[PDB]
């Protein structure tokens, strides 16, 4: 049988190469069972005329496949579209020898399209592999507003979210812009120092100039770029040691032709044995139909492999990707590029000399350039954090103790409108003193701006929910640590990470001297005899809301509750409130301290206290180790007996 295939090129010299390739492929199987032909058409400066030329070529024979290549024209974006649209109207499978645009992977717009070279968006897997190998966790991604850049950023973010790691900060700039030092300045104020760049050559050169002017190209930084940012005028001026990647034998425009011809021949050899010989369409005007087995041929060609290609074993992904083509690591060794390693997308194998870095050092740089001056946020709670006003001399009054040592005090500013300075001291302040002395850092304590502990909530006329209070301040970046009696819950643990607990506690009842645990119908059902309340925007509100069986009790609580503190203890004292529910230690200290107050029953739901920290912060391991060693030393027992047990 006579089998006809087509191709489109622009060399008029590699067309002879294509003819030789198809002849050699027919030499593999030439028993007249299947016979191969060849046709070719040259490019034109006019897109419409090229479309009718492809129409004439398709009506010339019973073509089964189309091969398209890149002409010497500088418009590489829309070059293969005039053929692709007309071919996909009839569902004629096509192959792209050299093409990198990421618009042809949308199968819903381009019905039939294949490819043999990895498009630009698949570098993200290599970047993720390099990050995993080098163990760089906190990264910054800078991209453009183009579709390809947005898609690549989305793919990288999807991979990170699958790893459940996310990105430290993502910032994008509009294409074709200059004097954009604002974005670099914004990105330079973060602890993480590794830059991922993806833009055009001119944008790359402008960004390199801005970064060089901003001194961010020196030591301690490691920035990697793709393949399009290390070519042309961009490669002229660039910091030394910039990591990069390149294709194995890309832009050859002749090595892939043989592989494409062999794959087409192999696919059509198996396709010809099918019962449905649809006789691919021959007609361009009046033929308002499609090829009956076009999808079948496309599926067969997609799942057809090769034995020994010039570029290696050839396979197809779910959309026609190159299926693990090679990649070559690059570098900037004193204005000259060099190969440093070879990776095929699965693993990297360093088989060259050492790699230099922008600062000129040989040691491998680490990200997360740690600071030494952290801000600390806290809340006003009686047994733990005492807030007092300062004297006129600038220091709040000294207060010795019976033990023979003075109480440590620090100056805390922030509280309400006002931002007056005060003095803070107590349990958590002593713990902070010891922690900072152990781990060698400096602190600047302040208070919250709302008074609430922090509770997730979604405001009206919006779909995003933002934390309020102390928790919202931590995520927003105003505070780097939370030294306060902050309980640990699942919702809190979703977005931050805590240390090991340093105190265990629960919830109990405070009543002025029939009241019992939460089982009585007097508590299950509303009544004027007994009234219970909490502090709103807190953890107890979430606990009683996260229970369908307690909806009535939640409604009764939501009828009225205090946005307050020990003032609620006074409200209980003034006989306005019948009973109180709160954390065990807070209620117990006041019950055993002043007078005439008794805790009812015992704990019913237990939880611990912990320091809050941002996601995957580097401070976690040392904080946990120090807390544990202070548990076992006996220091926490001394602190407990000093601050909580000196009563009754």
């Amino acid at each position: 049988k006579i089998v006809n295939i087509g191709a489109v090129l622009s060399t008029r010299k590699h067309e002879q190469m294509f003819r030789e390739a198809v002849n050699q492929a027919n030499k593999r199987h030439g028993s007249w069972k299947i016979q191969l032909n060849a046709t070719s058409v040259t490019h034109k400066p006019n897109a419409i005329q090229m479309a009718l030329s492809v129409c004439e070529d398709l009506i010339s024979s019973q073509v089964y496949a189309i091969l398209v290549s890149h002409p010497p024209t500088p418009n590489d974006h829309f070059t293969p579209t005039p053929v692709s649209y007309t071919a996909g109207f009839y569902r004629i499978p096509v192959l792209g020898l050299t093409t990198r645009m990421s618009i042809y992977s949308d199968k819903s717009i381009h019905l039939s399209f294949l490819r043999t070279v990895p498009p630009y968006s698949h570098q993200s897997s290599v970047w993720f592999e390099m990050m995993r190998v080098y163990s760089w966790n906190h990264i910054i991604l800078l991209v453009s507003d183009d579709h390809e850049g947005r898609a690549a950023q989305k793919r990288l973010e999807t991979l990170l979210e699958e790893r459940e790691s996310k990105a430290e900060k993502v910032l994008q700039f509009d294409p074709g812009t200059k004097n954009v030092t604002a974005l670099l300045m914004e990105a330079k104020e973060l602890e993480a120092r590794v830059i991922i760049l993806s833009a055009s050559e001119d944008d790359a050169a402008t960004v390199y100039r801005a970064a060089a002017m901003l001194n961010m190209t020196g030591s301690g930084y490691v920035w990697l770029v793709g393949e399009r940012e290390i070519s042309g005028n961009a490669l002229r001026y660039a910091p030394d040691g910039i990591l990069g990647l390149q294709l194995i034998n890309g832009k050859n425009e002749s090595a892939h032709i043989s592989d494409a011809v062999g794959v087409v021949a192999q696919a059509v050899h198996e396709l010809l044995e099918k019962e449905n010989i649809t006789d691919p369409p021959r007609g361009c005007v009046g033929n308002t139909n499609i090829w009956k087995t076009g999808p079948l041929f496309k599926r067969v060609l997609m799942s057809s492999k090769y034995a020994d290609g010039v570029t290696g074993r050839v396979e197809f992904n779910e959309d026609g990707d190159r299926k693990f083509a090679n990649y070559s690591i690059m570098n900037l060794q004193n204005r000259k590029l060099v190969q440093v390693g070879i990776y095929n997308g699965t693993h990297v194998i360093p088989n060259d000399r050492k790699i230099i870095w922008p600062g000129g050092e040989t040691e491998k740089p680490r990200g997360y350039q740690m600071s030494t001056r952290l801000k600390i946020v806290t809340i006003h709670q009686e047994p733990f954090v005492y807030v007092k006003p300062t004297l006129s001399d600038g220091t709040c009054k000294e207060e010795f103790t019976v033990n023979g040592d003075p109480v440590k005090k620090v100056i805390c500013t922030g509280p309400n409108r006002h931002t007056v300075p005060q003095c803070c001291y107590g349990f958590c302040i002593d713990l902070l003193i010891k922690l900072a002395r152990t781990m060698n850092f400096t602190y600047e304590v302040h208070l919250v701006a709302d008074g609430k502990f922090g509770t997730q909530e979604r405001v009206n006329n919006s779909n995003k929910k933002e934390w309020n209070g102390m928790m919202g301040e931590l995520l927003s970046g105003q505070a780097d640590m939370i030294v306060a009696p902050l309980t640990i819950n699942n919702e809190r643990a979703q977005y931050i990470e805590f240390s090991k607990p340093f105190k265990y506690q629960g919830l109990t009842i405070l009543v002025k001297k029939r009241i019992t645990g939460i089982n009585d119908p007097r508590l299950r059902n509303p009544s004027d005899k007994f009234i219970y309340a909490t502090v709103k925007q807190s953890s107890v509100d979430i606990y009683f809301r996260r229970q369908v069986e307690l909806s009535t009790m939640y409604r009764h609580m939501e009828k009225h509750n205090y946005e307050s503190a020990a003032e609620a203890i006074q409200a209980v004292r003034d006989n306005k409130l019948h009973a109180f529910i709160w954390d065990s230690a807070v209620l117990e200290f006041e019950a055993s301290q002043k007078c005439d107050l008794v805790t009812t029953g015992e704990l019913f739901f237990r939880s611990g206290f912990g320091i809050g920290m941002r996601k995957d912060s580097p401070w976690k391991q040392n904080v946990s180790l120090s807390i544990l060693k202070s548990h076992e030393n006996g220091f926490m027992e001394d602190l407990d007996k000093t601050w909580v047990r000196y009563q009754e």
């Binding site: 400066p45 006019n46 897109a47 419409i48 999808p295």
Partner: protein
């Protein structure tokens, strides 16, 4: 804000009647009171035909599909379930002359809205044989002004993506007449319903129950 507890998601592969075995097994082990399907008009005649053999077309079950299917709204085909809810754009019952008049009116309304600015009446490009239009001249103001022009009290705000943003859409269903009928509009983001209770017209299920005080 609702809980919206989903049961399962199934991806089928249905086409010509050769590979039509795994899909039947996949659909046989799935049960739900409400289904949301996504297929073309050329695959509905297969998916509903297969569902009808697995007990998925009874009055106890309801369906909901987008406007991608049911292309021939004038003559609905057979094997379709009775009472399938779909959403269509405004003027689904309008005539072809009405549609042409509306399009011409929108285009001329944009042209006259620019004419009220007394700037110009921009001319089109030359032809195809020269491949013109290398850059975008000041004529982009015409395209910009052709977006937010309304007509006859109908919002025609076109999004930058080429699709209209918030006209009014209605809900249609197949009654016991093999004819689609309107159910409720969605004007100003408030849902209207013609039926306070679903009719569920026509072994069985969905038995009625009574209690009192």
């Amino acid at each position: 804000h609702v809980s919206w507890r989903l049961l399962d998601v199934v991806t089928l592969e249905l086409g010509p009647g050769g590979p039509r075995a795994r899909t039947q097994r996949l659909l046989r082990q799935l049960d739900a009171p409400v289904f949301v399907a996504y297929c073309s008009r050329e695959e509905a005649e297969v998916l509903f035909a297969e569902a009808a053999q697995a007990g998925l077309v009874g009055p106890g079950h309801v369906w909901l599909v987008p406007n991608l299917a049911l292309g021939s709204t004038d003559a609905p085909p057979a094997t379709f379930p009775v009472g399938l809810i779909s959403v269509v754009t405004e003027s689904w019952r309008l005539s072809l002359r009405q549609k042409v008049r509306d399009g011409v009116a929108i285009l001329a309304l944009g042209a006259h809205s620019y004419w009220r600015q007394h700037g110009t009446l921009p001319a089109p490009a030359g032809d195809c044989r020269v491949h013109p239009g290398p850059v975008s001249p000041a004529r982009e103001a015409f395209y910009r002004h052709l977006l937010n022009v309304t007509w006859e009290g109908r919002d025609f705000s076109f999004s930058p993506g080429g699709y209209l943003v918030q006209p009014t859409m209605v809900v249609i269903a197949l009654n016991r007449h093999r004819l689609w009928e309107m159910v409720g509009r969605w004007e100003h983001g408030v849902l209207y319903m013609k039926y306070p209770v679903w009719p569920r017209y026509s072994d069985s299920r969905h038995l009625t129950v009574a209690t009192l005080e």
